[PDB]
Design a protein around this nucleic acid. Structure first.
Ligand SMILES: [Cl-]
Ligand SMILES: [Cl-]
Ligand SMILES: [Cl-]
Ligand SMILES: [Cl-]
Ligand SMILES: [Mn+2]
Ligand SMILES: [Mn+2]
Ligand SMILES: [Mn+2]
Ligand SMILES: [Mn+2]
Ligand SMILES: [Mn+2]
Lengths: 108, 98, 93, 11, 86, 107, 92, 97, 78
DNA sequence: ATCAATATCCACCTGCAGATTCTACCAAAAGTGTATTTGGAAACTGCTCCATCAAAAGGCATGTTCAGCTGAATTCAGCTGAACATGCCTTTTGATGGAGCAGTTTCCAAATACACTTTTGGTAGAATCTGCAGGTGGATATTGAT
DNA sequence: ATCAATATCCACCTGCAGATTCTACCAAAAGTGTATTTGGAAACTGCTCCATCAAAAGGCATGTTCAGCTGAATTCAGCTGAACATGCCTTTTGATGGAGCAGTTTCCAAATACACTTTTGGTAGAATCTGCAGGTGGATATTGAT
């Protein structure tokens, strides 16, 4: 026999390829599933996770914090044009809002 | 006897509540409300505490977005005070109502 | 019983991009929702493409078109890169 | 057959 | 045994709470008619989300509304919520 | 034995068999119950009936005997429940409901 | 080769309004309509089956779907014609 | 020489176009625009006539709904004239921005 | 070709929308919005056309595109 | 409000071409009869998670007072945008031809679905660490009164 | 232009609730060996799409005049913000009983998988109709003038 190397390792991904493949079969998106689809998709989910985590870690750093809380995920999402579009209709529990005061309200 | 001019504390608050994330409705009252409504739909229901908290996050996030839109409608009307007129125009444009 | 999640993997990625940073259970919950929401969007959209073209099988080509439709702009470009580079790397064993 | 809100019935 | 009858709890959503929600929403000045408006709008929102949630609960032949039931409801209404499973 | 179309045994006009096929072909679940295409065909027939009734009425009011898209639009938007169900749909050639805001009016 | 719902729409139109006819564009609208509603009901039912780790879409799922998707009276009559179609079919 | 007061014909037009369903943009211009746009995405395309008509119905219906909302936003500000300002507020409330 | 969407055309559309009086700045604004609409819908359409390995944009490509954008259109296929 | 005097619509009537409706037939679905799996319902029951309750306390909600200043009403004029008449051209439309393609078949190698059979990676708790939330206090800015 | 009265900011502190680390079973990948499709890769239709061609007609762009509306400016009443006294009820923390999930088995009634057998639904000609598109002529609306 040969030793096992996880499909995640062979695509050089962190995200579980086997697991994404299974979830693809089980959800009845199609009769059959190509061998590369769970690989590609996991690659995408990992990329996007990576991006959210980069920006959110930044926001944790800026607010003196070393542990990411939902607020940092929120600042990270709402301050980036594209993440905010992608998650335009999503609520992040404990997110708060971006501090923003309409100009006209400010003293004159 | 010192006294901030009307509006000054309002702004103090906007900055305050905009900097935090804690829920702004009291938990127990709210829980009580959700059970009432639910009960009128189906009797003898039980709620995971999670469910209730989900409802509150959902609800508070909704109202807050709605006040943001409402606020823009007050501004649009060259006012600084939000009125029912404004909530109505927000809910109508969003498509929430006929 | 066993509850599957993506915490293992999110945490791996968190260590790659921010080694000195950790993450709260609440935040991880937010991230796990995130991976599941996007998974379903991509997969669903892809499923529609397979059906539109009377094909019975979802290949990495469907995942890709799906991505181009679902994700915006730069996020799409970089996504398609990471993807294609995973499939090519994987194919050559 | 089927009853509509208006009261009418299908064939 | 059984619990005290629930009645008029929308009034639990007090005027100060509604004002905090507005402050987070960036509102400076508030018409006195706003509080009842808000309670109305809040009430319709909860009714719709809960109606769906409870519908999922009933479909599962269960007596407990779960966080997932709520989350599915939110999703149906296009108010997708992150952080509670799903 | 002789053939009885499932639609006929279900007392419907809408095609039960076909709906069952679309249910399998559509990858909605691994398996499809025997009554589900019956129920579904029933609902589809019902909704169709309701729409055709009201649009037909609208055809009569605009004194036409042939329903065109306009009559469907009038029928959908003048009925509260159909209008909510079809709130985010565009009926080609539908036009709009005539409506002028009071404030715009003369005098 | 290209199938549609024109036949059945037309039959129902005759049940409801024997004296009324329908233009081709309009038939197209109605055909779109039937596929739009079919897909909504079917999809929601699909989600229902999966949430409950069930492998099969039964009339129970269609019904729950309908209660979620249709508003008010439309729901009530839908569920009515639904269950009574399943009953009549169940008999013979 | 007789002359309608400003607003009378505007209203008369409103009652007119709300009563019909024909497309309101001249076809060829729109077709030309659509092909232009498409060229930025992929070269040497061909369009079903149906496809272009689909785009036109979709597009006119959209703009008309947008004007309904814009008009409400004009009314809200104690105005009767719609301005870019109103379209912008409409599109921001809709979530288009 | 966008200036092809003329001022009388836009004025008719606003008229169907119930509009009485119209600022002159509206027309470029509208052409702008129209242009963005068309960009999003056609971009998705062409994505459908390319995935199908086709060279012709079909009504169905357009319709799926619209549905995606939450602009469901009836009358050009299901 | 009437009296005329432009223009706008609206009904009644009518003929007819483009669609609609209807016929006449055939492949592709749909229905049958049998033979297999298969799910998910029934019946226990193990056990988290929920409903209640108690008690103490201080965080917060209410109600009241009072006056700043915001909303609304009025006034008014400058100028933007509507209505109209004119005149030029881009749009319509109506074939006509031709050819670029989407749509069909018919094979095959490649790619995927199975059916078993070992081998880990992931998960569920306990065993350990450690951010950081609240709590202070001094310095700094901000705000409103004189 | 200054000075009290507050609020904000920010560094340090400390115990702890909530992460992080560490282990042990076990469901889920992974690896192999046959069994099936699947969807191109080529080989060809018919067909919608594009490209001219070529008039005429309304539809669009210009330019003029001014109605009325939008924007600005002022005033003032009265509403909503700020602050305080009062005291209620939400919040916290733990305890218990028990309801109802959820995990495991056991097993028919229900659904899938073939292989035929029939009937319907779709296509493309054949056989009809409903508006449309026009034409006056009859009320209707709009606007200016007494
Ligand atoms: Cl693949
Ligand atoms: Cl109001
Ligand atoms: Cl069933
Ligand atoms: Cl503007
Ligand atoms: Mn009650
Ligand atoms: Mn089983
Ligand atoms: Mn702190
Ligand atoms: Mn037949
Ligand atoms: Mn006519």
């Amino acid at each position: 026999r040969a030793k096992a190397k996880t499909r995640s390792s062979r695509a050089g991904l962190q995200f579980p390829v086997g697991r994404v493949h299974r979830l693809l079969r089980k959800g009845n998106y199609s009769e059959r599933v190509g061998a590369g689809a769970p690989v590609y998709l996991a690659a995408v989910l990992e990329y996007l996770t990576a991006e959210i985590l980069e920006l959110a870690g930044n926001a944790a750093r800026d607010n003196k914090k070393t542990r990411i809380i939902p607020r940092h995920l929120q600042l990270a999402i709402r301050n980036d044009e594209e993440l905010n579009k992608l998650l335009g209709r999503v609520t992040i529990a404990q997110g708060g809002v971006l501090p923003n005061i309409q100009a006209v309200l400010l003293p004159k | 006897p010192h006294r901030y001019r009307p509006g000054t504390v309002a702004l103090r608050e906007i900055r305050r509540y905009q900097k935090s994330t804690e829920l702004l409705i009291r938990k127990l009252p709210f829980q009580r409300l959700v059970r009432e409504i639910a009960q009128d739909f189906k009797t003898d229901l039980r709620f995971q505490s999670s469910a209730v908290m989900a409802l509150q996050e959902a609800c508070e996030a909704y109202l807050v977005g709605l006040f943001e839109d409402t606020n823009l409608c007050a501004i649009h009307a060259k006012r600084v005070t939000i009125m029912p007129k404004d909530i109505q125009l927000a809910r109508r444009i969003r498509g929430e109502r006929a | 019983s066993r509850k599957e999640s993506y915490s293992i993997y999110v945490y791996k990625v968190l260590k790659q991009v921010h080694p000195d940073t950790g993450i709260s259970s609440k935040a991880m919950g937010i991230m796990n929702s995130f991976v599941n929401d996007i998974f379903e969007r991509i997969a669903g959209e892809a499923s529609r493409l397979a059906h539109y073209n009377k094909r019975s099988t979802i290949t990495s080509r469907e995942i890709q078109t799906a991505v181009r439709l679902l994700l915006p702009g730069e996020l799409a470009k970089h996504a398609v890169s990471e993807g294609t580079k995973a499939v090519t790397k994987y194919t050559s064993a | 057959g089927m009853r509509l809100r208006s009261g009418r019935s299908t064939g | 045994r059984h619990r005290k009858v629930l009645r008029d709890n929308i009034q639990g959503i007090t005027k100060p709470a509604i004002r905090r929600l507005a402050r987070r929403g960036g509102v400076k000045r508030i018409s006195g008619l706003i509080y009842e408006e808000t309670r109305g709008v809040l009430k319709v929102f909860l009714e719709n989300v809960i109606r769906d949630a409870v519908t999922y609960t009933e479909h599962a032949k269960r007596k407990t509304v779960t966080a997932m039931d709520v989350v599915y409801a939110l999703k149906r209404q296009g108010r997708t919520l992150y952080g509670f499973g799903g």
